[PDB]
Design an enzyme around this catalytic site. Structure first.
Site, PDB file in Angstrom:
ATOM      1  N   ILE A  10      -0.254   0.595  -9.882  1.00 23.57           N
ATOM      2  CA  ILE A  10       1.118   0.841  -9.534  1.00 23.57           C
ATOM      3  C   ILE A  10       1.870  -0.398  -9.783  1.00 23.57           C
ATOM      4  O   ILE A  10       3.005  -0.327 -10.229  1.00 23.57           O
ATOM      5  CB  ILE A  10       1.305   1.239  -8.058  1.00 23.57           C
ATOM      6  CG1 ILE A  10       0.727   2.597  -7.791  1.00 23.57           C
ATOM      7  CG2 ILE A  10       2.812   1.223  -7.663  1.00 23.57           C
ATOM      8  CD1 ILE A  10       0.652   2.897  -6.302  1.00 23.57           C
ATOM      9  N   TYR A  15      -0.108  -9.408  -1.995  1.00 26.81           N
ATOM     10  CA  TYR A  15      -1.500  -9.825  -1.797  1.00 26.81           C
ATOM     11  C   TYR A  15      -2.486  -9.429  -2.863  1.00 26.81           C
ATOM     12  O   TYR A  15      -3.653  -9.864  -2.840  1.00 26.81           O
ATOM     13  CB  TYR A  15      -2.037  -9.274  -0.475  1.00 26.81           C
ATOM     14  CG  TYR A  15      -1.130  -9.667   0.601  1.00 26.81           C
ATOM     15  CD1 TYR A  15      -0.139  -8.833   0.998  1.00 26.81           C
ATOM     16  CD2 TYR A  15      -1.202 -10.930   1.143  1.00 26.81           C
ATOM     17  CE1 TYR A  15       0.760  -9.223   1.949  1.00 26.81           C
ATOM     18  CE2 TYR A  15      -0.295 -11.364   2.048  1.00 26.81           C
ATOM     19  CZ  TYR A  15       0.702 -10.499   2.450  1.00 26.81           C
ATOM     20  OH  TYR A  15       1.618 -10.884   3.389  1.00 26.81           O
ATOM     21  N   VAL A  17      -3.397  -6.496  -6.444  1.00 27.70           N
ATOM     22  CA  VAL A  17      -3.021  -5.412  -7.309  1.00 27.70           C
ATOM     23  C   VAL A  17      -3.030  -4.203  -6.420  1.00 27.70           C
ATOM     24  O   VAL A  17      -3.801  -4.168  -5.481  1.00 27.70           O
ATOM     25  CB  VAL A  17      -3.979  -5.271  -8.479  1.00 27.70           C
ATOM     26  CG1 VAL A  17      -5.454  -5.260  -8.011  1.00 27.70           C
ATOM     27  CG2 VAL A  17      -3.621  -4.058  -9.245  1.00 27.70           C
ATOM     28  N   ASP A  79       9.580   2.970  -4.979  1.00 29.86           N
ATOM     29  CA  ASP A  79      10.227   1.944  -4.127  1.00 29.86           C
ATOM     30  C   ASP A  79      11.741   1.825  -4.405  1.00 29.86           C
ATOM     31  O   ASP A  79      12.272   2.370  -5.395  1.00 29.86           O
ATOM     32  CB  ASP A  79       9.573   0.573  -4.217  1.00 29.86           C
ATOM     33  CG  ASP A  79       9.763  -0.100  -5.564  1.00 29.86           C
ATOM     34  OD1 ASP A  79      10.877  -0.093  -6.097  1.00 29.86           O
ATOM     35  OD2 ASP A  79       8.806  -0.658  -6.145  1.00 29.86           O
ATOM     36  N   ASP A 120       8.686 -10.089   5.695  1.00 22.89           N
ATOM     37  CA  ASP A 120       8.862 -10.122   4.274  1.00 22.89           C
ATOM     38  C   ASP A 120       9.448  -8.833   3.660  1.00 22.89           C
ATOM     39  O   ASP A 120       8.924  -8.305   2.691  1.00 22.89           O
ATOM     40  CB  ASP A 120       7.555 -10.466   3.607  1.00 22.89           C
ATOM     41  CG  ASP A 120       7.763 -10.863   2.173  1.00 22.89           C
ATOM     42  OD1 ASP A 120       8.898 -11.315   1.855  1.00 22.89           O
ATOM     43  OD2 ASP A 120       6.888 -10.702   1.298  1.00 22.89           O
TER      44      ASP A 120
HETATM   45  N1  LIG Z   1       3.938   4.412  -4.417  1.00 23.85           N
HETATM   46  C1  LIG Z   1       3.583   3.416  -3.593  1.00 23.85           C
HETATM   47  N2  LIG Z   1       3.698   2.103  -3.940  1.00 23.85           N
HETATM   48  C2  LIG Z   1       3.321   1.138  -3.106  1.00 23.85           C
HETATM   49  O1  LIG Z   1       3.455  -0.161  -3.393  1.00 23.85           O
HETATM   50  C3  LIG Z   1       4.640  -0.225  -4.220  1.00 23.85           C
HETATM   51  C4  LIG Z   1       5.139  -1.653  -4.314  1.00 23.85           C
HETATM   52  C5  LIG Z   1       3.950  -2.612  -4.541  1.00 23.85           C
HETATM   53  C6  LIG Z   1       4.364  -3.490  -5.694  1.00 23.85           C
HETATM   54  C7  LIG Z   1       5.557  -2.787  -6.298  1.00 23.85           C
HETATM   55  O2  LIG Z   1       6.011  -3.166  -7.369  1.00 23.85           O
HETATM   56  N3  LIG Z   1       5.992  -1.756  -5.501  1.00 23.85           N
HETATM   57  C8  LIG Z   1       2.860   1.523  -1.802  1.00 23.85           C
HETATM   58  N4  LIG Z   1       2.461   0.766  -0.787  1.00 23.85           N
HETATM   59  C9  LIG Z   1       2.087   1.641   0.111  1.00 23.85           C
HETATM   60  N5  LIG Z   1       2.269   2.913  -0.293  1.00 23.85           N
HETATM   61  C10 LIG Z   1       2.735   2.901  -1.521  1.00 23.85           C
HETATM   62  N6  LIG Z   1       3.103   3.790  -2.420  1.00 23.85           N
END
Ligand SMILES: Nc1nc(OC[C@H]2CCC(=O)N2)c2nc[nH]c2n1
Length: 288
Positions: A10, A15, A17, A79, A120
Protein backbone atom coordinates in the site's frame (compact mmCIF):
# COMPACT_ATOMS: atom_id res chain seq x y z
CA UNK A 1 2.54 -14.65 8.99
CA UNK A 2 2.01 -17.85 7.10
CA UNK A 3 -1.63 -17.01 7.92
CA UNK A 4 -1.68 -14.03 5.50
CA UNK A 5 -1.22 -13.60 1.79
CA UNK A 6 0.08 -10.19 0.74
CA UNK A 7 -2.05 -8.69 -1.95
CA UNK A 8 -0.12 -5.55 -2.64
CA UNK A 9 2.04 -2.88 -1.12
CA UNK A 10 0.00 0.00 0.00
CA UNK A 11 2.88 2.22 0.87
CA UNK A 12 5.53 3.20 3.33
CA UNK A 13 4.45 4.23 6.72
CA UNK A 14 6.14 5.84 9.65
CA UNK A 15 7.45 2.41 10.92
CA UNK A 16 7.66 0.22 7.88
CA UNK A 17 6.15 -1.06 4.71
CA UNK A 18 2.36 -1.41 4.86
CA UNK A 19 0.72 -4.12 2.89
CA UNK A 20 -2.79 -5.03 1.93
CA UNK A 21 -3.18 -8.69 2.82
CA UNK A 22 -5.72 -11.42 3.00
CA UNK A 23 -6.08 -13.82 5.89
CA UNK A 24 -5.82 -17.39 4.58
CA UNK A 25 -8.25 -18.93 7.14
CA UNK A 26 -10.95 -16.30 7.72
CA UNK A 27 -10.55 -14.61 4.36
CA UNK A 28 -10.44 -11.17 6.07
CA UNK A 29 -8.78 -8.34 4.12
CA UNK A 30 -6.45 -6.32 6.38
CA UNK A 31 -3.65 -3.83 6.37
CA UNK A 32 -0.43 -5.39 7.66
CA UNK A 33 2.26 -3.11 9.01
CA UNK A 34 5.80 -4.31 9.51
CA UNK A 35 7.54 -2.52 12.43
CA UNK A 36 11.23 -1.90 11.76
CA UNK A 37 11.53 -5.96 20.35
CA UNK A 38 11.57 -4.43 23.80
CA UNK A 39 9.09 -5.54 26.45
CA UNK A 40 7.84 -2.01 27.09
CA UNK A 41 6.71 -1.63 23.49
CA UNK A 42 4.83 -4.93 23.37
CA UNK A 43 2.99 -3.98 26.57
CA UNK A 44 2.04 -0.56 25.29
CA UNK A 45 0.79 -1.86 21.99
CA UNK A 46 -1.01 -4.60 23.64
CA UNK A 47 -3.00 -2.05 25.58
CA UNK A 48 -4.12 -0.36 22.37
CA UNK A 49 -6.04 -3.47 21.38
CA UNK A 50 -8.73 -2.45 23.81
CA UNK A 51 -9.01 1.23 22.85
CA UNK A 52 -11.82 0.74 20.46
CA UNK A 53 -13.87 3.51 18.81
CA UNK A 54 -15.71 3.94 15.48
CA UNK A 55 -13.34 6.77 14.48
CA UNK A 56 -10.15 4.83 15.39
CA UNK A 57 -8.79 2.32 12.90
CA UNK A 58 -9.20 -1.03 14.69
CA UNK A 59 -6.01 -2.83 15.76
CA UNK A 60 -6.91 -6.45 15.07
CA UNK A 61 -3.86 -8.23 16.36
CA UNK A 62 -0.16 -8.00 17.06
CA UNK A 63 2.17 -10.65 15.68
CA UNK A 64 5.64 -11.10 17.14
CA UNK A 65 7.77 -13.90 15.66
CA UNK A 66 11.43 -14.39 15.20
CA UNK A 67 12.04 -11.07 16.66
CA UNK A 68 9.98 -9.28 13.96
CA UNK A 69 6.73 -7.38 14.74
CA UNK A 70 3.60 -6.97 12.63
CA UNK A 71 0.52 -5.09 13.48
CA UNK A 72 -2.74 -6.15 11.84
CA UNK A 73 -5.16 -3.37 11.26
CA UNK A 74 -8.62 -2.86 9.79
CA UNK A 75 -8.35 -1.97 6.06
CA UNK A 76 -9.93 1.18 4.62
CA UNK A 77 -9.96 2.14 1.07
CA UNK A 78 -8.07 5.43 0.96
CA UNK A 79 -6.25 8.06 3.06
CA UNK A 80 -7.09 11.75 3.27
CA UNK A 81 -3.99 12.85 1.38
CA UNK A 82 -5.10 10.86 -1.68
CA UNK A 83 -8.68 12.13 -1.26
CA UNK A 84 -7.49 15.72 -1.05
CA UNK A 85 -5.29 15.35 -4.12
CA UNK A 86 -8.12 13.81 -6.07
CA UNK A 87 -10.43 16.61 -4.97
CA UNK A 88 -7.98 19.34 -5.87
CA UNK A 89 -9.80 20.92 -8.84
CA UNK A 90 -12.76 21.75 -6.82
CA UNK A 91 -12.02 21.20 -3.09
CA UNK A 92 -13.78 18.93 -0.57
CA UNK A 93 -17.21 20.38 0.05
CA UNK A 94 -17.62 22.22 3.35
CA UNK A 95 -20.27 19.92 4.82
CA UNK A 96 -17.96 16.97 4.28
CA UNK A 97 -14.97 18.92 5.79
CA UNK A 98 -17.21 19.62 8.71
CA UNK A 99 -18.34 16.04 9.06
CA UNK A 100 -14.74 14.73 8.96
CA UNK A 101 -13.56 17.25 11.59
CA UNK A 102 -16.43 16.37 13.92
CA UNK A 103 -15.72 12.63 13.63
CA UNK A 104 -11.95 13.19 14.14
CA UNK A 105 -12.73 15.24 17.21
CA UNK A 106 -14.88 12.34 18.47
CA UNK A 107 -11.93 10.01 17.98
CA UNK A 108 -9.58 12.34 19.84
CA UNK A 109 -12.02 12.97 22.66
CA UNK A 110 -12.21 9.21 23.21
CA UNK A 111 -8.45 8.51 23.28
CA UNK A 112 -7.66 11.65 25.21
CA UNK A 113 -10.24 10.60 27.86
CA UNK A 114 -8.00 7.52 28.42
CA UNK A 115 -4.79 9.61 28.36
CA UNK A 116 -3.56 8.25 25.09
CA UNK A 117 -2.16 10.57 22.49
CA UNK A 118 -1.54 10.17 18.83
CA UNK A 119 1.38 12.61 18.48
CA UNK A 120 1.70 12.22 14.79
CA UNK A 121 -1.54 13.15 12.98
CA UNK A 122 -1.18 13.83 9.32
CA UNK A 123 -3.38 13.27 6.22
CA UNK A 124 -1.72 9.93 5.52
CA UNK A 125 -2.97 8.54 8.86
CA UNK A 126 -6.52 9.68 8.40
CA UNK A 127 -8.41 6.96 6.48
CA UNK A 128 -11.79 7.16 4.79
CA UNK A 129 -14.49 4.84 3.54
CA UNK A 130 -17.46 4.90 1.20
CA UNK A 131 -20.06 5.39 3.94
CA UNK A 132 -18.68 8.89 4.81
CA UNK A 133 -16.66 7.80 7.91
CA UNK A 134 -13.09 8.97 8.70
CA UNK A 135 -10.79 7.27 11.22
CA UNK A 136 -7.36 7.85 12.83
CA UNK A 137 -4.66 5.32 12.05
CA UNK A 138 -1.53 4.57 14.17
CA UNK A 139 -2.94 5.93 17.36
CA UNK A 140 -0.62 5.37 20.28
CA UNK A 141 2.33 4.04 18.23
CA UNK A 142 4.49 7.08 18.89
CA UNK A 143 4.75 6.54 22.58
CA UNK A 144 5.16 2.83 22.00
CA UNK A 145 7.92 2.97 19.40
CA UNK A 146 9.03 6.68 19.30
CA UNK A 147 8.80 9.11 16.32
CA UNK A 148 11.95 9.09 14.13
CA UNK A 149 13.50 11.83 11.92
CA UNK A 150 13.48 9.44 8.88
CA UNK A 151 11.39 6.37 8.10
CA UNK A 152 11.43 9.12 3.91
CA UNK A 153 11.52 12.30 5.83
CA UNK A 154 9.07 12.50 8.67
CA UNK A 155 6.88 15.53 8.07
CA UNK A 156 6.96 18.39 10.57
CA UNK A 157 4.01 20.13 9.04
CA UNK A 158 1.58 19.19 11.71
CA UNK A 159 3.86 19.37 14.72
CA UNK A 160 2.73 21.61 17.67
CA UNK A 161 4.98 24.49 18.71
CA UNK A 162 5.61 23.13 22.21
CA UNK A 163 7.22 20.03 20.68
CA UNK A 164 9.43 22.22 18.39
CA UNK A 165 10.36 24.36 21.36
CA UNK A 166 11.61 21.23 23.23
CA UNK A 167 8.88 20.76 25.86
CA UNK A 168 9.44 17.28 27.29
CA UNK A 169 5.98 16.64 28.72
CA UNK A 170 3.56 17.78 26.13
CA UNK A 171 -0.07 16.82 26.30
CA UNK A 172 -3.17 15.86 24.39
CA UNK A 173 -3.17 19.39 23.15
CA UNK A 174 -0.59 18.48 20.49
CA UNK A 175 -3.18 16.41 18.63
CA UNK A 176 -5.63 19.36 18.56
CA UNK A 177 -2.92 21.51 16.97
CA UNK A 178 -2.32 18.87 14.27
CA UNK A 179 -6.03 18.50 13.45
CA UNK A 180 -6.31 22.27 13.18
CA UNK A 181 -3.57 22.32 10.59
CA UNK A 182 -5.34 19.55 8.77
CA UNK A 183 -8.68 21.44 8.95
CA UNK A 184 -7.06 24.50 7.40
CA UNK A 185 -5.54 22.26 4.65
CA UNK A 186 -8.87 20.81 3.73
CA UNK A 187 -10.40 24.23 3.49
CA UNK A 188 -7.64 25.95 1.41
CA UNK A 189 -6.31 22.99 -0.55
CA UNK A 190 -2.87 23.87 0.62
CA UNK A 191 -0.79 22.80 3.67
CA UNK A 192 -0.93 25.55 6.28
CA UNK A 193 2.72 25.33 7.54
CA UNK A 194 4.86 23.22 5.14
CA UNK A 195 8.18 23.47 6.96
CA UNK A 196 11.22 21.75 5.58
CA UNK A 197 13.26 21.87 8.72
CA UNK A 198 12.62 22.43 12.41
CA UNK A 199 13.41 26.16 12.29
CA UNK A 200 11.64 26.56 8.99
CA UNK A 201 8.59 24.95 10.65
CA UNK A 202 8.68 27.27 13.62
CA UNK A 203 9.21 30.39 11.57
CA UNK A 204 6.26 29.47 9.31
CA UNK A 205 4.10 29.23 12.41
CA UNK A 206 5.45 32.49 13.74
CA UNK A 207 4.98 34.24 10.38
CA UNK A 208 1.22 33.41 10.43
CA UNK A 209 0.33 33.48 14.13
CA UNK A 210 2.84 36.07 15.38
CA UNK A 211 6.06 35.27 17.18
CA UNK A 212 4.87 33.99 20.65
CA UNK A 213 5.85 35.90 23.80
CA UNK A 214 5.06 36.02 27.44
CA UNK A 215 1.81 37.92 26.74
CA UNK A 216 0.24 35.15 24.63
CA UNK A 217 2.10 32.19 26.13
CA UNK A 218 3.34 32.51 29.72
CA UNK A 219 6.54 30.56 30.16
CA UNK A 220 7.36 30.32 26.49
CA UNK A 221 10.63 32.24 26.80
CA UNK A 222 11.87 29.55 29.23
CA UNK A 223 11.35 26.64 26.88
CA UNK A 224 14.56 24.70 26.04
CA UNK A 225 14.76 25.66 22.37
CA UNK A 226 13.41 29.17 22.62
CA UNK A 227 15.85 31.92 21.55
CA UNK A 228 15.41 35.68 22.30
CA UNK A 229 16.91 36.21 18.87
CA UNK A 230 13.88 34.71 17.08
CA UNK A 231 12.58 37.33 14.66
CA UNK A 232 9.38 39.02 15.89
CA UNK A 233 6.67 38.80 13.33
CA UNK A 234 3.12 40.24 13.65
CA UNK A 235 0.14 37.92 13.65
CA UNK A 236 -2.15 37.76 10.56
CA UNK A 237 -5.98 37.75 10.54
CA UNK A 238 -7.57 34.33 10.15
CA UNK A 239 -9.60 36.05 7.43
CA UNK A 240 -6.42 35.98 5.36
CA UNK A 241 -5.33 32.50 6.42
CA UNK A 242 -8.34 30.37 5.61
CA UNK A 243 -10.55 32.83 3.59
CA UNK A 244 -13.27 30.72 2.41
CA UNK A 245 -14.20 29.72 5.99
CA UNK A 246 -17.03 31.40 7.76
CA UNK A 247 -16.65 33.03 11.21
CA UNK A 248 -17.71 29.93 13.21
CA UNK A 249 -15.05 27.90 11.44
CA UNK A 250 -12.45 30.63 11.89
CA UNK A 251 -13.32 30.89 15.58
CA UNK A 252 -12.90 27.16 16.13
CA UNK A 253 -9.64 27.03 14.11
CA UNK A 254 -8.15 29.89 16.15
CA UNK A 255 -8.94 28.06 19.42
CA UNK A 256 -7.38 24.89 18.07
CA UNK A 257 -4.28 26.96 17.12
CA UNK A 258 -3.74 28.74 20.49
CA UNK A 259 -0.03 28.90 21.30
CA UNK A 260 -0.55 28.07 25.01
CA UNK A 261 -1.32 24.36 25.18
CA UNK A 262 -3.27 24.78 28.38
CA UNK A 263 -5.65 27.24 26.70
CA UNK A 264 -5.89 25.43 23.42
CA UNK A 265 -9.44 24.04 23.08
CA UNK A 266 -9.98 20.42 24.03
CA UNK A 267 -11.59 17.85 21.70
CA UNK A 268 -14.64 17.58 23.97
CA UNK A 269 -15.17 21.36 24.04
CA UNK A 270 -14.52 21.60 20.32
CA UNK A 271 -17.42 19.20 19.73
CA UNK A 272 -19.72 21.68 21.48
CA UNK A 273 -18.60 24.64 19.30
CA UNK A 274 -21.32 26.35 17.27
CA UNK A 275 -19.52 25.41 14.00
CA UNK A 276 -21.08 21.99 14.45
CA UNK A 277 -24.65 23.21 14.89
CA UNK A 278 -25.61 22.07 11.43
CA UNK A 279 -23.19 19.18 11.00
CA UNK A 280 -24.25 16.28 8.80
CA UNK A 281 -22.70 13.11 7.38
CA UNK A 282 -22.38 13.35 3.62
CA UNK A 283 -20.78 10.62 1.54
CA UNK A 284 -17.75 11.31 -0.59
CA UNK A 285 -17.32 10.52 -4.22
CA UNK A 286 -14.70 7.74 -4.15
CA UNK A 287 -13.16 6.05 -7.21
CA UNK A 288 -11.59 2.83 -5.95
N1 LIG B 1 -5.91 1.31 3.21
C1 LIG B 1 -5.21 1.44 4.34
N2 LIG B 1 -4.00 2.07 4.39
C2 LIG B 1 -3.32 2.17 5.53
O1 LIG B 1 -2.16 2.82 5.62
C3 LIG B 1 -2.26 3.88 4.65
C4 LIG B 1 -1.19 4.93 4.90
C5 LIG B 1 0.16 4.23 5.19
C6 LIG B 1 1.16 4.92 4.29
C7 LIG B 1 0.32 5.69 3.30
O2 LIG B 1 0.85 6.21 2.33
N3 LIG B 1 -1.01 5.69 3.66
C8 LIG B 1 -3.93 1.65 6.72
N4 LIG B 1 -3.48 1.65 7.97
C9 LIG B 1 -4.41 0.98 8.62
N5 LIG B 1 -5.43 0.60 7.82
C10 LIG B 1 -5.16 0.97 6.59
N6 LIG B 1 -5.75 0.90 5.42
Amino acid sequence: MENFQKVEKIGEGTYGVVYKARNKLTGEVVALKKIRVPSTAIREISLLKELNHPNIVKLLDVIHTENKLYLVFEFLHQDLKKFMDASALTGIPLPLIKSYLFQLLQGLAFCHSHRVLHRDLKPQNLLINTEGAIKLADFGLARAFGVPVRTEVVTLWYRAPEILLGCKYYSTAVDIWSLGCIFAEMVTRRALFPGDSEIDQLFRIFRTLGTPDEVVWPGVTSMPDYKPSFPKWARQDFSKVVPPLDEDGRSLLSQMLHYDPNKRISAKAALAHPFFQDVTKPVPHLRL
